[PDB]
PDB file of C-alpha atoms in Angstrom:
ATOM      1  CA  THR Y 723     -22.623   8.896 -64.762  1.00 14.13           C
ATOM      2  CA  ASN Y 724     -22.790  11.350 -67.445  1.00 13.10           C
ATOM      3  CA  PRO Y 725     -26.205  11.009 -69.066  1.00 11.06           C
ATOM      4  CA  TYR Y 726     -25.141  12.974 -72.114  1.00 12.73           C
ATOM      5  CA  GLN Y 727     -22.145  11.133 -72.988  1.00 15.14           C
ATOM      6  CA  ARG Y 728     -22.168   9.058 -76.251  1.00 12.25           C
ATOM      7  CA  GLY Y 729     -19.774   6.842 -78.600  1.00 10.21           C
ATOM      8  CA  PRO Y 730     -16.636   5.329 -78.059  1.00 11.68           C
ATOM      9  CA  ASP Y 731     -13.577   7.219 -76.533  1.00 10.85           C
ATOM     10  CA  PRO Y 732     -12.295   9.310 -79.135  1.00  7.95           C
ATOM     11  CA  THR Y 733      -8.774   9.139 -80.868  1.00  6.63           C
ATOM     12  CA  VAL Y 734      -6.929  11.725 -82.897  1.00  6.65           C
ATOM     13  CA  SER Y 735      -7.256   9.359 -85.607  1.00  7.37           C
ATOM     14  CA  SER Y 736     -10.851   9.073 -84.983  1.00  6.69           C
ATOM     15  CA  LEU Y 737     -11.922  13.255 -84.791  1.00  4.83           C
ATOM     16  CA  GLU Y 738      -9.781  14.065 -87.802  1.00  6.64           C
ATOM     17  CA  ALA Y 739     -11.430  11.190 -90.212  1.00  8.67           C
ATOM     18  CA  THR Y 740     -13.737  12.518 -92.553  1.00  9.49           C
ATOM     19  CA  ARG Y 741     -16.717  10.241 -90.565  1.00 10.80           C
ATOM     20  CA  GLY Y 742     -17.476   9.908 -87.032  1.00 10.03           C
ATOM     21  CA  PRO Y 743     -18.609   6.423 -85.807  1.00 10.94           C
ATOM     22  CA  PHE Y 744     -22.369   6.610 -85.698  1.00 15.47           C
ATOM     23  CA  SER Y 745     -24.293   6.048 -88.990  1.00 18.49           C
ATOM     24  CA  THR Y 746     -26.351   8.755 -90.379  1.00 20.46           C
ATOM     25  CA  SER Y 747     -29.056   9.585 -92.391  1.00 20.40           C
ATOM     26  CA  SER Y 748     -30.854  13.305 -93.776  1.00 21.40           C
ATOM     27  CA  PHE Y 749     -33.897  14.947 -94.782  1.00 19.65           C
ATOM     28  CA  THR Y 750     -35.219  18.358 -96.430  1.00 17.09           C
ATOM     29  CA  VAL Y 751     -37.449  20.385 -94.396  1.00 16.68           C
ATOM     30  CA  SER Y 752     -40.638  20.199 -95.980  1.00 15.70           C
ATOM     31  CA  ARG Y 753     -42.234  23.295 -94.803  1.00 18.48           C
ATOM     32  CA  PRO Y 754     -39.143  25.876 -93.218  1.00 20.25           C
ATOM     33  CA  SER Y 755     -40.897  27.937 -90.203  1.00 18.31           C
ATOM     34  CA  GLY Y 756     -38.739  31.269 -90.089  1.00 18.24           C
ATOM     35  CA  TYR Y 757     -35.999  30.805 -92.316  1.00 18.01           C
ATOM     36  CA  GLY Y 758     -35.795  29.792 -95.902  1.00 18.16           C
ATOM     37  CA  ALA Y 759     -34.788  26.175 -96.234  1.00 19.64           C
ATOM     38  CA  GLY Y 760     -33.252  23.590 -94.179  1.00 19.09           C
ATOM     39  CA  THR Y 761     -31.570  20.010 -94.115  1.00 18.46           C
ATOM     40  CA  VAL Y 762     -31.584  17.938 -91.014  1.00 18.18           C
ATOM     41  CA  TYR Y 763     -28.662  15.591 -90.537  1.00 17.80           C
ATOM     42  CA  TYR Y 764     -29.103  12.923 -87.587  1.00 15.73           C
ATOM     43  CA  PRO Y 765     -27.571   9.762 -86.157  1.00 16.20           C
ATOM     44  CA  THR Y 766     -29.580   6.642 -86.323  1.00 17.72           C
ATOM     45  CA  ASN Y 767     -27.319   4.903 -83.407  1.00 16.78           C
ATOM     46  CA  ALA Y 768     -25.927   7.000 -81.092  1.00 17.31           C
ATOM     47  CA  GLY Y 769     -26.986   5.134 -78.052  1.00 16.63           C
ATOM     48  CA  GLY Y 770     -29.753   7.691 -76.595  1.00 15.91           C
ATOM     49  CA  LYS Y 771     -30.889  11.768 -77.352  1.00 15.08           C
ATOM     50  CA  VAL Y 772     -28.212  13.672 -78.478  1.00 12.81           C
ATOM     51  CA  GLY Y 773     -28.115  17.835 -78.616  1.00 10.52           C
ATOM     52  CA  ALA Y 774     -29.050  19.718 -82.001  1.00  8.40           C
ATOM     53  CA  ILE Y 775     -26.596  22.495 -83.709  1.00  7.81           C
ATOM     54  CA  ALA Y 776     -28.002  25.088 -86.527  1.00  9.75           C
ATOM     55  CA  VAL Y 777     -25.504  25.944 -89.120  1.00  9.01           C
ATOM     56  CA  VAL Y 778     -25.847  29.224 -91.120  1.00  8.80           C
ATOM     57  CA  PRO Y 779     -24.083  30.595 -94.526  1.00 12.24           C
ATOM     58  CA  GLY Y 780     -22.509  34.025 -94.877  1.00 10.87           C
ATOM     59  CA  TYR Y 781     -23.999  36.717 -97.146  1.00 10.39           C
ATOM     60  CA  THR Y 782     -25.058  35.704-100.685  1.00 11.54           C
ATOM     61  CA  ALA Y 783     -24.000  32.250 -99.572  1.00 15.56           C
ATOM     62  CA  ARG Y 784     -26.329  28.789 -99.745  1.00 15.92           C
ATOM     63  CA  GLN Y 785     -26.129  25.411 -97.583  1.00 15.09           C
ATOM     64  CA  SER Y 786     -23.355  24.015 -99.701  1.00 17.21           C
ATOM     65  CA  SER Y 787     -20.748  26.536 -98.047  1.00 17.73           C
ATOM     66  CA  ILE Y 788     -21.441  25.152 -94.745  1.00 18.14           C
ATOM     67  CA  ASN Y 789     -23.262  21.903 -95.077  1.00 20.18           C
ATOM     68  CA  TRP Y 790     -19.797  19.755 -94.728  1.00 24.63           C
ATOM     69  CA  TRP Y 791     -20.530  20.249 -90.968  1.00 23.02           C
ATOM     70  CA  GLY Y 792     -23.669  18.113 -91.553  1.00 25.22           C
ATOM     71  CA  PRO Y 793     -22.203  14.808 -91.838  1.00 23.64           C
ATOM     72  CA  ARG Y 794     -19.301  15.462 -89.891  1.00 23.14           C
ATOM     73  CA  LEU Y 795     -21.169  16.132 -86.796  1.00 23.28           C
ATOM     74  CA  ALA Y 796     -24.045  13.885 -87.370  1.00 23.08           C
ATOM     75  CA  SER Y 797     -21.393  11.231 -86.839  1.00 23.13           C
ATOM     76  CA  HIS Y 798     -20.040  11.738 -83.866  1.00 19.51           C
ATOM     77  CA  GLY Y 799     -24.047  11.932 -82.452  1.00 18.45           C
ATOM     78  CA  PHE Y 800     -25.811  15.276 -83.165  1.00 19.72           C
ATOM     79  CA  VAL Y 801     -28.519  16.302 -85.029  1.00 22.86           C
ATOM     80  CA  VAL Y 802     -27.529  19.366 -87.097  1.00 26.44           C
ATOM     81  CA  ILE Y 803     -29.882  21.701 -89.432  1.00 31.23           C
ATOM     82  CA  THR Y 804     -28.181  23.471 -92.259  1.00 31.10           C
ATOM     83  CA  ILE Y 805     -30.184  26.484 -93.365  1.00 27.30           C
ATOM     84  CA  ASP Y 806     -30.816  28.943 -96.500  1.00 29.28           C
ATOM     85  CA  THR Y 807     -31.759  31.904 -95.132  1.00 30.98           C
ATOM     86  CA  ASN Y 808     -34.774  33.651 -96.645  1.00 32.69           C
ATOM     87  CA  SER Y 809     -33.165  36.426 -98.465  1.00 32.16           C
ATOM     88  CA  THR Y 810     -29.389  35.262 -99.572  1.00 31.68           C
ATOM     89  CA  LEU Y 811     -28.731  39.138 -98.601  1.00 28.12           C
ATOM     90  CA  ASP Y 812     -29.949  38.813 -95.155  1.00 31.96           C
ATOM     91  CA  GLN Y 813     -27.608  40.539 -91.949  1.00 30.66           C
ATOM     92  CA  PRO Y 814     -26.180  39.306 -88.739  1.00 31.04           C
ATOM     93  CA  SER Y 815     -29.423  39.762 -86.707  1.00 31.61           C
ATOM     94  CA  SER Y 816     -31.619  38.334 -89.040  1.00 34.73           C
ATOM     95  CA  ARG Y 817     -29.619  35.328 -89.604  1.00 35.63           C
ATOM     96  CA  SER Y 818     -29.628  34.544 -85.648  1.00 37.23           C
ATOM     97  CA  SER Y 819     -33.443  35.024 -85.692  1.00 39.14           C
ATOM     98  CA  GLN Y 820     -33.522  32.462 -88.694  1.00 41.40           C
ATOM     99  CA  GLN Y 821     -30.687  30.523 -86.642  1.00 38.29           C
ATOM    100  CA  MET Y 822     -32.736  30.170 -83.353  1.00 36.13           C
ATOM    101  CA  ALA Y 823     -35.913  29.683 -85.777  1.00 40.42           C
ATOM    102  CA  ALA Y 824     -34.187  26.594 -87.012  1.00 39.50           C
ATOM    103  CA  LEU Y 825     -33.495  25.376 -83.696  1.00 37.15           C
ATOM    104  CA  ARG Y 826     -37.507  25.489 -82.789  1.00 35.01           C
ATOM    105  CA  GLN Y 827     -38.103  23.713 -85.758  1.00 35.90           C
ATOM    106  CA  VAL Y 828     -35.877  20.952 -84.721  1.00 35.52           C
ATOM    107  CA  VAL Y 829     -37.504  21.009 -81.488  1.00 34.57           C
ATOM    108  CA  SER Y 830     -40.815  20.970 -83.070  1.00 31.70           C
ATOM    109  CA  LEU Y 831     -40.029  18.227 -85.468  1.00 30.75           C
ATOM    110  CA  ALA Y 832     -38.582  16.136 -82.251  1.00 32.57           C
ATOM    111  CA  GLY Y 833     -41.945  16.037 -80.875  1.00 36.02           C
ATOM    112  CA  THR Y 834     -43.503  15.005 -84.169  1.00 36.08           C
ATOM    113  CA  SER Y 835     -44.093  11.571 -84.621  1.00 31.86           C
ATOM    114  CA  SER Y 836     -43.935  11.516 -88.198  1.00 32.16           C
ATOM    115  CA  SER Y 837     -40.538  12.948 -88.291  1.00 32.26           C
ATOM    116  CA  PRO Y 838     -37.276  10.966 -88.800  1.00 30.60           C
ATOM    117  CA  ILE Y 839     -35.981  12.821 -85.482  1.00 32.85           C
ATOM    118  CA  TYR Y 840     -38.852  12.237 -83.271  1.00 28.88           C
ATOM    119  CA  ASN Y 841     -37.657  11.507 -79.757  1.00 25.92           C
ATOM    120  CA  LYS Y 842     -33.927  11.755 -80.852  1.00 24.73           C
ATOM    121  CA  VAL Y 843     -33.281  15.515 -79.602  1.00 24.24           C
ATOM    122  CA  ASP Y 844     -32.577  16.529 -76.232  1.00 23.56           C
ATOM    123  CA  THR Y 845     -34.158  20.113 -76.707  1.00 23.54           C
ATOM    124  CA  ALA Y 846     -32.519  21.020 -73.942  1.00 21.57           C
ATOM    125  CA  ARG Y 847     -28.811  20.629 -75.615  1.00 20.85           C
ATOM    126  CA  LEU Y 848     -28.751  23.492 -78.649  1.00 24.69           C
ATOM    127  CA  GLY Y 849     -25.865  25.000 -80.321  1.00 24.18           C
ATOM    128  CA  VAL Y 850     -24.947  27.551 -83.249  1.00 20.83           C
ATOM    129  CA  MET Y 851     -22.061  27.654 -85.956  1.00 21.94           C
ATOM    130  CA  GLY Y 852     -21.991  29.694 -89.315  1.00 22.92           C
ATOM    131  CA  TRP Y 853     -19.833  31.634 -91.502  1.00 23.95           C
ATOM    132  CA  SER Y 854     -19.006  35.054 -91.770  1.00 26.98           C
ATOM    133  CA  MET Y 855     -22.416  37.053 -91.404  1.00 24.39           C
ATOM    134  CA  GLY Y 856     -23.659  33.640 -90.329  1.00 22.81           C
ATOM    135  CA  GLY Y 857     -20.845  33.247 -87.788  1.00 20.54           C
ATOM    136  CA  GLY Y 858     -21.349  37.104 -86.306  1.00 22.12           C
ATOM    137  CA  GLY Y 859     -25.444  35.803 -86.367  1.00 24.99           C
ATOM    138  CA  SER Y 860     -23.922  32.522 -84.038  1.00 23.00           C
ATOM    139  CA  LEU Y 861     -22.523  35.203 -81.653  1.00 24.84           C
ATOM    140  CA  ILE Y 862     -25.666  37.132 -81.952  1.00 25.31           C
ATOM    141  CA  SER Y 863     -27.708  33.775 -80.836  1.00 23.33           C
ATOM    142  CA  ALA Y 864     -25.186  32.890 -77.912  1.00 24.67           C
ATOM    143  CA  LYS Y 865     -25.247  36.861 -76.411  1.00 24.72           C
ATOM    144  CA  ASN Y 866     -29.442  37.003 -76.802  1.00 22.95           C
ATOM    145  CA  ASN Y 867     -29.824  33.060 -75.329  1.00 21.64           C
ATOM    146  CA  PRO Y 868     -27.143  32.180 -72.975  1.00 21.70           C
ATOM    147  CA  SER Y 869     -28.888  28.804 -72.444  1.00 23.49           C
ATOM    148  CA  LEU Y 870     -27.403  27.491 -75.851  1.00 24.29           C
ATOM    149  CA  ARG Y 871     -24.750  25.199 -74.785  1.00 24.75           C
ATOM    150  CA  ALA Y 872     -21.698  25.856 -77.447  1.00 20.53           C
ATOM    151  CA  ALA Y 873     -20.983  28.454 -80.519  1.00 21.54           C
ATOM    152  CA  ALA Y 874     -18.303  27.127 -82.881  1.00 21.71           C
ATOM    153  CA  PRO Y 875     -18.705  30.382 -85.308  1.00 19.42           C
ATOM    154  CA  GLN Y 876     -15.967  30.437 -88.308  1.00 19.45           C
ATOM    155  CA  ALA Y 877     -14.448  33.784 -89.904  1.00 19.52           C
ATOM    156  CA  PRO Y 878     -17.489  35.623 -87.909  1.00 19.48           C
ATOM    157  CA  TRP Y 879     -18.416  39.187 -89.459  1.00 22.94           C
ATOM    158  CA  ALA Y 880     -20.653  41.585 -87.084  1.00 18.51           C
ATOM    159  CA  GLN Y 881     -21.165  45.299 -85.934  1.00 17.59           C
ATOM    160  CA  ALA Y 882     -22.079  44.176 -82.488  1.00 15.67           C
ATOM    161  CA  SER Y 883     -19.936  43.536 -79.254  1.00 16.88           C
ATOM    162  CA  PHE Y 884     -20.006  40.188 -77.209  1.00 19.09           C
ATOM    163  CA  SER Y 885     -18.588  40.929 -74.188  1.00 21.76           C
ATOM    164  CA  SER Y 886     -21.838  39.367 -71.921  1.00 21.93           C
ATOM    165  CA  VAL Y 887     -21.600  36.465 -74.074  1.00 17.15           C
ATOM    166  CA  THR Y 888     -21.155  33.509 -71.438  1.00 16.13           C
ATOM    167  CA  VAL Y 889     -21.829  30.408 -74.115  1.00 18.63           C
ATOM    168  CA  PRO Y 890     -18.652  28.103 -74.497  1.00 17.06           C
ATOM    169  CA  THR Y 891     -17.122  29.952 -77.647  1.00 16.29           C
ATOM    170  CA  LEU Y 892     -14.570  28.494 -79.902  1.00 15.87           C
ATOM    171  CA  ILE Y 893     -13.806  31.051 -83.028  1.00 14.71           C
ATOM    172  CA  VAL Y 894     -12.357  29.272 -86.193  1.00 13.50           C
ATOM    173  CA  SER Y 895     -10.290  32.148 -88.047  1.00 14.30           C
ATOM    174  CA  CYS Y 896      -8.732  32.399 -91.700  1.00 13.68           C
ATOM    175  CA  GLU Y 897      -5.136  34.145 -90.935  1.00  9.20           C
ATOM    176  CA  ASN Y 898      -5.424  35.844 -94.604  1.00  9.31           C
ATOM    177  CA  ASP Y 899      -9.294  37.135 -94.395  1.00  8.09           C
ATOM    178  CA  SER Y 900     -10.201  40.072 -96.268  1.00  9.02           C
ATOM    179  CA  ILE Y 901     -13.881  39.981 -96.005  1.00  9.41           C
ATOM    180  CA  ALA Y 902     -14.084  39.490 -92.265  1.00 10.55           C
ATOM    181  CA  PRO Y 903     -10.195  40.496 -91.466  1.00 11.66           C
ATOM    182  CA  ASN Y 904      -9.524  39.216 -87.836  1.00 12.31           C
ATOM    183  CA  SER Y 905      -8.268  42.468 -86.873  1.00 11.91           C
ATOM    184  CA  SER Y 906     -11.970  43.864 -86.946  1.00 11.52           C
ATOM    185  CA  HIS Y 907     -13.657  40.797 -86.316  1.00 10.22           C
ATOM    186  CA  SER Y 908     -12.365  37.613 -84.449  1.00 11.45           C
ATOM    187  CA  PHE Y 909      -9.829  39.131 -82.733  1.00  8.79           C
ATOM    188  CA  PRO Y 910     -12.046  42.064 -81.163  1.00 11.15           C
ATOM    189  CA  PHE Y 911     -14.617  39.347 -80.656  1.00 12.64           C
ATOM    190  CA  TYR Y 912     -12.180  37.220 -78.385  1.00 13.52           C
ATOM    191  CA  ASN Y 913     -10.871  39.706 -77.117  1.00 12.54           C
ATOM    192  CA  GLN Y 914     -14.068  40.951 -75.519  1.00 13.44           C
ATOM    193  CA  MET Y 915     -15.385  37.895 -74.512  1.00 12.03           C
ATOM    194  CA  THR Y 916     -14.237  37.817 -70.492  1.00 10.00           C
ATOM    195  CA  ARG Y 917     -16.726  35.940 -69.133  1.00  9.95           C
ATOM    196  CA  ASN Y 918     -17.093  32.575 -71.054  1.00  8.65           C
ATOM    197  CA  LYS Y 919     -14.698  29.670 -71.851  1.00 11.48           C
ATOM    198  CA  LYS Y 920     -13.169  30.139 -75.186  1.00 14.78           C
ATOM    199  CA  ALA Y 921     -10.784  29.498 -77.628  1.00 14.82           C
ATOM    200  CA  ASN Y 922      -9.499  30.618 -81.047  1.00 14.06           C
ATOM    201  CA  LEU Y 923      -7.701  28.593 -84.066  1.00 16.66           C
ATOM    202  CA  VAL Y 924      -6.250  30.660 -86.422  1.00 19.13           C
ATOM    203  CA  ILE Y 925      -5.814  28.726 -89.918  1.00 18.30           C
ATOM    204  CA  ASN Y 926      -2.352  29.727 -91.538  1.00 19.42           C
ATOM    205  CA  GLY Y 927      -2.951  31.199 -94.854  1.00 19.72           C
ATOM    206  CA  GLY Y 928      -6.494  30.666 -95.287  1.00 18.90           C
ATOM    207  CA  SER Y 929      -9.031  33.072 -97.463  1.00 19.83           C
ATOM    208  CA  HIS Y 930     -12.073  33.640 -96.072  1.00 20.42           C
ATOM    209  CA  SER Y 931     -13.313  30.401 -97.464  1.00 22.70           C
ATOM    210  CA  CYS Y 932     -10.808  28.282 -95.208  1.00 23.03           C
ATOM    211  CA  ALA Y 933     -13.369  26.614 -92.941  1.00 24.45           C
ATOM    212  CA  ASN Y 934     -16.314  25.853 -95.428  1.00 18.77           C
ATOM    213  CA  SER Y 935     -17.283  22.615 -97.324  1.00 18.00           C
ATOM    214  CA  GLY Y 936     -14.393  21.170 -99.427  1.00 18.89           C
ATOM    215  CA  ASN Y 937     -11.479  22.909 -97.626  1.00 17.84           C
ATOM    216  CA  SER Y 938      -8.068  21.087 -97.486  1.00 19.86           C
ATOM    217  CA  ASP Y 939      -8.142  21.463 -93.253  1.00 19.93           C
ATOM    218  CA  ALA Y 940     -11.041  19.615 -92.782  1.00 21.54           C
ATOM    219  CA  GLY Y 941      -9.268  16.966 -90.732  1.00 20.33           C
ATOM    220  CA  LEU Y 942      -7.775  19.565 -88.447  1.00 19.28           C
ATOM    221  CA  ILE Y 943     -11.153  21.728 -88.227  1.00 17.00           C
ATOM    222  CA  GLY Y 944     -13.476  19.132 -88.125  1.00 16.36           C
ATOM    223  CA  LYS Y 945     -11.740  17.609 -84.974  1.00 14.51           C
ATOM    224  CA  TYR Y 946     -11.815  21.083 -83.400  1.00 14.07           C
ATOM    225  CA  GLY Y 947     -15.466  21.591 -84.118  1.00 11.96           C
ATOM    226  CA  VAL Y 948     -16.290  17.983 -83.066  1.00 13.33           C
ATOM    227  CA  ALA Y 949     -14.413  18.270 -79.797  1.00 12.92           C
ATOM    228  CA  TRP Y 950     -15.795  21.658 -78.786  1.00 12.36           C
ATOM    229  CA  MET Y 951     -19.466  20.502 -79.228  1.00 13.92           C
ATOM    230  CA  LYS Y 952     -18.541  17.082 -77.343  1.00 10.65           C
ATOM    231  CA  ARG Y 953     -17.107  18.882 -74.622  1.00 13.94           C
ATOM    232  CA  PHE Y 954     -19.718  21.970 -74.130  1.00 14.95           C
ATOM    233  CA  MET Y 955     -22.831  20.276 -75.859  1.00 12.02           C
ATOM    234  CA  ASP Y 956     -22.365  16.794 -73.930  1.00  9.01           C
ATOM    235  CA  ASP Y 957     -20.263  17.882 -70.699  1.00  9.07           C
ATOM    236  CA  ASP Y 958     -18.056  15.182 -72.722  1.00  8.66           C
ATOM    237  CA  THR Y 959     -14.750  15.715 -70.647  1.00  8.99           C
ATOM    238  CA  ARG Y 960     -13.388  12.506 -72.583  1.00 10.17           C
ATOM    239  CA  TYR Y 961     -12.633  15.352 -75.391  1.00 10.40           C
ATOM    240  CA  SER Y 962     -11.027  17.875 -72.527  1.00 10.06           C
ATOM    241  CA  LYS Y 963      -7.510  16.798 -73.973  1.00  8.79           C
ATOM    242  CA  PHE Y 964      -8.068  17.747 -77.527  1.00  9.13           C
ATOM    243  CA  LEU Y 965      -8.604  21.372 -76.831  1.00 10.68           C
ATOM    244  CA  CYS Y 966      -6.686  22.198 -73.711  1.00  9.61           C
ATOM    245  CA  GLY Y 967      -3.877  18.610 -73.117  1.00  8.27           C
ATOM    246  CA  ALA Y 968      -1.461  16.980 -74.799  1.00  6.11           C
ATOM    247  CA  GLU Y 969      -3.220  15.923 -77.867  1.00  4.67           C
ATOM    248  CA  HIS Y 970      -3.771  19.978 -78.506  1.00  2.63           C
ATOM    249  CA  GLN Y 971      -0.221  20.838 -77.541  1.00  2.29           C
ATOM    250  CA  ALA Y 972       1.021  18.232 -80.556  1.00  2.00           C
ATOM    251  CA  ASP Y 973      -1.393  20.425 -82.925  1.00  2.00           C
ATOM    252  CA  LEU Y 974       0.602  23.183 -82.303  1.00  2.00           C
ATOM    253  CA  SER Y 975       3.789  22.625 -84.258  1.00  2.00           C
ATOM    254  CA  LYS Y 976       1.269  22.176 -87.432  1.00  2.00           C
ATOM    255  CA  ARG Y 977       2.085  24.359 -90.213  1.00  2.00           C
ATOM    256  CA  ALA Y 978      -1.865  24.710 -90.728  1.00  2.00           C
ATOM    257  CA  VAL Y 979      -2.146  26.387 -87.303  1.00  2.00           C
ATOM    258  CA  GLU Y 980      -0.931  30.294 -87.430  1.00  2.00           C
ATOM    259  CA  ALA Y 981      -1.949  30.659 -83.700  1.00  2.00           C
ATOM    260  CA  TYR Y 982      -4.333  29.114 -81.068  1.00  2.00           C
ATOM    261  CA  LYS Y 983      -5.620  31.135 -78.171  1.00  2.00           C
ATOM    262  CA  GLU Y 984      -7.238  29.550 -75.394  1.00  2.00           C
ATOM    263  CA  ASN Y 985      -8.273  30.103 -71.265  1.00  2.00           C
ATOM    264  CA  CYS Y 986      -7.698  26.128 -70.519  1.00  2.00           C
ATOM    265  CA  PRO Y 987      -8.295  24.605 -68.261  1.00  2.00           C
ATOM    266  CA  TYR Y 988     -12.297  24.239 -68.941  1.00  2.00           C
ATOM    267  CA  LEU Y 989     -13.399  23.339 -65.573  1.00  2.00           C
ATOM    268  CA  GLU Y 990     -16.598  21.995 -64.368  1.00  2.00           C
TER     269      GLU Y 990
END
């Protein structure tokens, strides 16, 4: 019935694992169009076209900060492009422009017969992620392009307001962030968004890098990122229980969950 549904029925163990069920590969973008550099991660056996997600680092940072998301999401049925920005010193509006450029190049490569992702992407189903100024850029992308299916920034930094956002947005926040303090960034952004499905996962004791490659909470954080993108990029209500149901409630006793805010249930 759901034409976008891919893969086996999820379990807690399957979403906390380092990899999902699908086999994956990756390639470097030969000629990046409107951004600095990219790596594309993709499933080889997803069982149909999949949505695509663009992930952007923060100020001074590169793909290595955020690229654990590439194999983690791709192995659950997504095409993921992890980027470097034209300059490590680019600010959120610029990061957002580059993020959308990266999505546009994934759309271009999906129509290119020589590309490994030829005919693999549903070019109508796109999402945004990123760290710090790249997370603020994700929220800007969603504000400016409401046809995006999902946003899942981490420790976002921005000097912008997001009251108009209608895109389903998960913010991952790090309790002890001194760089994008939640009292100035994550929490005001969450409170501003009155028009969308939303959630805010706050990681206990986390510094600003608490959701980056190599983090010690990747089972938990990766479960939420994947379940958010499945629910909203694929309309896959099999994943609702991890966001709003009994599985979600079971997480709330974990030491690593400082706080969790949401406007469940998420109705179709």
